[PDB]
């Protein structure tokens, strides 16, 4: 991200609205929701992200 | 038949609930709430009288 360069939309992460009961307490969905919440708020990974994922 | 499903047990501690368990241990249960009983209310009123 840059101050001047804009993007199509500020937030890329989906938000889980319904279905908390069927999601486990420590399943992958809960952890991924935490990661999405972190990504929306401005956190960023320390490890580099490749331009094209593998 | 009426209540003979429940006469198969002890009437002192009766309760109704249902559950089903997934493979990973996720248990979902339904415990209905008992609605008002007009017959029981009238019986209690008669006992009070």
DSSP B7-49: HTS-GGG----EEEE-SSS-EEEE-PPPPP-HHHHHHHHHHH-
| A24 and B CB contact within 8 Å | yes
Residue of chain A whose Cα is closest to the Cα of B27? A22
Interacting residues of B5 by C-beta distance below 8 A, sequence separation 6+: none
Tell me whether residues B28 and A21 touch, CB distance under 8 A.
yes
How distant is the Cα of A22 from the closest Cα of chain B, in angstroms? 8
Tell me whether residues A21 and B24 touch, CB distance under 8 A.
no
Structure-block tokens of residue B31: 């415990």
- Interrupted backbone of chain A, residues before each interruption (C–N > 2.5 Å): none
Query: What distance lies between CA A25 and its chain's CA centroid?
Result: 19
Angle at A27 between CA A26 and CA A33, to 5 degrees: 95
């Amino acid at each position: 991200a840059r101050s001047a360069q804009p993007v199509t939309r500020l937030d890329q992460c989906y938000h889980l609205r319904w279905g908390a009961q069927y999601v486990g307490e420590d399943s992958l969905t809960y952890r991924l929701g935490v990661l999405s919440l972190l990504a929306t708020n401005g956190y960023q990974l320390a490890r580099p992200i490749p331009k094209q994922l593998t | 038949m009426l209540l003979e499903p429940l006469l198969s047990g002890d009437p002192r501690m009766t309760q109704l609930a249902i559950q089903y368990q997934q493979y990973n241990g996720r248990t979902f249960n339904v415990i209905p709430e008992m609605p008002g009983s007009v017959i029981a209310d009238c019986v209690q009123l008669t006992a009070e009288v």
